[PDB]
mmCIF file of C-alpha atoms and ligand atoms in Angstrom:
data_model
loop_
_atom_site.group_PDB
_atom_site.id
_atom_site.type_symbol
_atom_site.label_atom_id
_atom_site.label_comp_id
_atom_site.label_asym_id
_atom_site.label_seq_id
_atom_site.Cartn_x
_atom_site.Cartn_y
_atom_site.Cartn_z
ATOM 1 C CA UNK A 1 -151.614 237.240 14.793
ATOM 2 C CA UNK A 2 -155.156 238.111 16.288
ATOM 3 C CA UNK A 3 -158.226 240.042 14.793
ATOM 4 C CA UNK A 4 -159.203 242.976 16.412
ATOM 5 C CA UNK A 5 -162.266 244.933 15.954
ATOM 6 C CA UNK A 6 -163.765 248.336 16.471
ATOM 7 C CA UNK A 7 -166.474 248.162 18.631
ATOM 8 C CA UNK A 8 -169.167 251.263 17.915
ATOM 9 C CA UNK A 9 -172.697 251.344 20.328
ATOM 10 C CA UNK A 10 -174.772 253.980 18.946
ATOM 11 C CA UNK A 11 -177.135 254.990 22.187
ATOM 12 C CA UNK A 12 -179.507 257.657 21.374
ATOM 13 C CA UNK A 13 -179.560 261.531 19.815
ATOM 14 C CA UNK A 14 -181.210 264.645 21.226
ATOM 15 C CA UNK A 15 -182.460 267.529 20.386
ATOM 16 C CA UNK A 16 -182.883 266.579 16.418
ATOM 17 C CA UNK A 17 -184.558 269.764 14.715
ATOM 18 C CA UNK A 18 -188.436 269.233 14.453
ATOM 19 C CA UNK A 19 -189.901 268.958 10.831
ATOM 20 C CA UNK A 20 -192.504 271.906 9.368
ATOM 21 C CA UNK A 21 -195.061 269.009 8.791
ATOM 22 C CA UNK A 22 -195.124 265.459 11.343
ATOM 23 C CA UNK A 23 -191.376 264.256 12.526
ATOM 24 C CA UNK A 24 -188.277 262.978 11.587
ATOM 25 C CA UNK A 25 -187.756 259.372 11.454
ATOM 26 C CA UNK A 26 -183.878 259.244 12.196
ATOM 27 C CA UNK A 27 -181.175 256.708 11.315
ATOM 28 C CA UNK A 28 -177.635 256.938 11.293
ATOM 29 C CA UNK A 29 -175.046 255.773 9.284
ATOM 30 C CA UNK A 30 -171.542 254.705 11.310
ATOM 31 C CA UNK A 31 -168.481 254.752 8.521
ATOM 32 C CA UNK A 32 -165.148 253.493 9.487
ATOM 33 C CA UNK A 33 -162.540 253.627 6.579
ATOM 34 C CA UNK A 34 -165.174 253.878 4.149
ATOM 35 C CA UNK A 35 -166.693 251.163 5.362
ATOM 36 C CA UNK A 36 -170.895 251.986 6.041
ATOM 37 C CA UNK A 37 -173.024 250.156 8.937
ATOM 38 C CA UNK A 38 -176.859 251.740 9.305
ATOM 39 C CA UNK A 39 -178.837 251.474 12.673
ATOM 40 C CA UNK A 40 -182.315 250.921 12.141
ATOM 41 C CA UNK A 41 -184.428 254.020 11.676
ATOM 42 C CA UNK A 42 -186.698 255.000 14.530
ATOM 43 C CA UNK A 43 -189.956 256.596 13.831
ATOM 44 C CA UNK A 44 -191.143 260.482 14.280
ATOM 45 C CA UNK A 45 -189.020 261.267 17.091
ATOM 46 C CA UNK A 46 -187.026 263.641 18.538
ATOM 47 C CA UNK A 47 -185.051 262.500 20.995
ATOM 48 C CA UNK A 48 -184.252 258.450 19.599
ATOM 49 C CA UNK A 49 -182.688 256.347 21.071
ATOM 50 C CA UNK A 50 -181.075 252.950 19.674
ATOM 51 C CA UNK A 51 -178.571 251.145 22.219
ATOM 52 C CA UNK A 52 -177.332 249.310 18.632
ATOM 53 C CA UNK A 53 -173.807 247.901 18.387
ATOM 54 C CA UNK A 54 -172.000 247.728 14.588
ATOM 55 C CA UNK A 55 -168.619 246.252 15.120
ATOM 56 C CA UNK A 56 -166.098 246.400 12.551
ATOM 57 C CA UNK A 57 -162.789 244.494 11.216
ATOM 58 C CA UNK A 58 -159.580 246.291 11.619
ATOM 59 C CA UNK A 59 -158.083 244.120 9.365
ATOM 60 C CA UNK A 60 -154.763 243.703 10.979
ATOM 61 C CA UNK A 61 -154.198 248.064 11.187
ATOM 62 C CA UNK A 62 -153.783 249.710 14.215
ATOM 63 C CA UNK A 63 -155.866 253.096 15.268
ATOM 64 C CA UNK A 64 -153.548 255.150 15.423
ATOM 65 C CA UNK A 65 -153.018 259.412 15.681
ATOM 66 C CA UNK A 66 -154.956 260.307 12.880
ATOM 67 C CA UNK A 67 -158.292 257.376 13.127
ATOM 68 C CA UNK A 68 -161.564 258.925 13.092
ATOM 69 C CA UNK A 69 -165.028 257.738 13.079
ATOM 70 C CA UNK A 70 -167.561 259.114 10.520
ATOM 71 C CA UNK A 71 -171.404 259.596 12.004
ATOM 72 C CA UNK A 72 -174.040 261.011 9.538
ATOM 73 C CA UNK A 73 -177.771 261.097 11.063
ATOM 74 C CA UNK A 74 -180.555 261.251 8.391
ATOM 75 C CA UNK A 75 -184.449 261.462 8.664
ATOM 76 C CA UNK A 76 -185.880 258.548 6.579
ATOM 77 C CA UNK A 77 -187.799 259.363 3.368
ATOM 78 C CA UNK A 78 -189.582 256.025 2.147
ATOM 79 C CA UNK A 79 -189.507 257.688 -1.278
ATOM 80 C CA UNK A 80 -185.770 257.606 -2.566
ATOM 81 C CA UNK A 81 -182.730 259.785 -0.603
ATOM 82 C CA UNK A 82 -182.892 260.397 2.975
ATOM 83 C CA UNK A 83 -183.125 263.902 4.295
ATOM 84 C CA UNK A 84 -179.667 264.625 5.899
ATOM 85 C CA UNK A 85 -179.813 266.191 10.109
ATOM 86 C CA UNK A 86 -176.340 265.989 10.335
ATOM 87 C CA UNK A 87 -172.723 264.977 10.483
ATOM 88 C CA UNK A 88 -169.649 264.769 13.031
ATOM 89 C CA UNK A 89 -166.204 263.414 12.253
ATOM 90 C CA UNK A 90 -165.039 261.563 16.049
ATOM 91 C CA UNK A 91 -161.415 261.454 16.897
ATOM 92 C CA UNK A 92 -160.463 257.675 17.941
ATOM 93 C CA UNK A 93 -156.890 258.876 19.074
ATOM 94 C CA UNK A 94 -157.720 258.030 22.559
ATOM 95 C CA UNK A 95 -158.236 254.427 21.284
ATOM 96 C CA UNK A 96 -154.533 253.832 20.449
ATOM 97 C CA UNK A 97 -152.259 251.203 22.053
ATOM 98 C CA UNK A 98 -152.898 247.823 22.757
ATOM 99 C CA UNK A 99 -154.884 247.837 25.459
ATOM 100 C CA UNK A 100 -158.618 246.584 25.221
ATOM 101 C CA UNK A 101 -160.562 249.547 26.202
ATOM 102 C CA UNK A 102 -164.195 251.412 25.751
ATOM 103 C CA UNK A 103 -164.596 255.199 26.456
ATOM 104 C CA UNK A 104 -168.113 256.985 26.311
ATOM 105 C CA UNK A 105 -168.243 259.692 23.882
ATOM 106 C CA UNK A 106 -170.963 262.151 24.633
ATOM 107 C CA UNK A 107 -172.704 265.119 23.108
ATOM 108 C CA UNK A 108 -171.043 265.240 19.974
ATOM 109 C CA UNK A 109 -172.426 268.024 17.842
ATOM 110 C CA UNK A 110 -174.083 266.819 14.971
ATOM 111 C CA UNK A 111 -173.641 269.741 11.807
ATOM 112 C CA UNK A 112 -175.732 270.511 9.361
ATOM 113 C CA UNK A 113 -173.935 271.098 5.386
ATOM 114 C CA UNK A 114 -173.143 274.203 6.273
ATOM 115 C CA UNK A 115 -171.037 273.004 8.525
ATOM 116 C CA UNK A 116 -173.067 274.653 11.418
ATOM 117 C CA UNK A 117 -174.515 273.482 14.993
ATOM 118 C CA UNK A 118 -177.988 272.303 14.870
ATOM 119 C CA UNK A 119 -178.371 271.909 18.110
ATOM 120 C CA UNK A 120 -178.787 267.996 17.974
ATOM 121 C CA UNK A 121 -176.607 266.056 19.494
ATOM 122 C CA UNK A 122 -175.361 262.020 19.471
ATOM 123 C CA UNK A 123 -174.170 259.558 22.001
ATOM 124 C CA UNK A 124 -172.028 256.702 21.381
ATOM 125 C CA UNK A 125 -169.388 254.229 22.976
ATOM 126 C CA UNK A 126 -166.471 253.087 21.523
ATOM 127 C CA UNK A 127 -163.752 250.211 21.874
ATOM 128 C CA UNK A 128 -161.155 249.068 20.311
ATOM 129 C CA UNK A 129 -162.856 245.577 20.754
HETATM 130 SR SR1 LIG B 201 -192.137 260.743 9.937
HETATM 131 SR SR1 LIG B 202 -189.230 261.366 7.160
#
């Protein structure tokens, strides 16, 4: 039996809410089954943008109706936790099957803990290898 892999390419964010004092520094963090890859952060900027690909092991389990992709964008503090921008949950439904395929998935809302819009947005592509 063969390995497959999700493929994730985190391209860029817009729109991420400017700071009181200088600018965010964002990073985000790409979780698949609990599972946690980080892009690298990029400095005071509002509109980053990465072009970073995190590919990870299926581990012989199929996507299937219910995967979903986990995408939490933070601003960087050098001093301990990161300041969370926001959050969105992706549906990989359109993933299933077993056909080799990558989709674009554009201007996803990213929420803040309330659960509302801030306004930023993220771009990625995903494959299921
Ligand atoms: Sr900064
Ligand atoms: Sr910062």
């Amino acid at each position: 039996a063969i390995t497959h892999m999700l493929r994730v390419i985190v391209e860029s964010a817009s729109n991420i809410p400017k700071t009181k004092f200088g600018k965010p520094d964002p990073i985000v963090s790409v979780i698949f089954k609990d599972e946690k890859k980080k892009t690298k952060k990029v400095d005071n900027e509002l509109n980053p943008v990465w072009n970073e690909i995190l590919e990870f092991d299926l581990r012989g389990i199929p996507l299937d109706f219910s995967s979903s992709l986990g995408i939490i964008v933070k601003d960087f503090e050098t001093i301990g936790q990161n300041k969370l921008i926001g959050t969105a949950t992706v549906a990989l439904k359109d993933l299933t099957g077993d056909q080799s395929r990558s989709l674009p998935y554009k201007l996803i809302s990213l929420l803040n803990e309330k659960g509302q819009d801030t306004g930023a947005t993220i771009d990625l592509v995903i494959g299921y290898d």
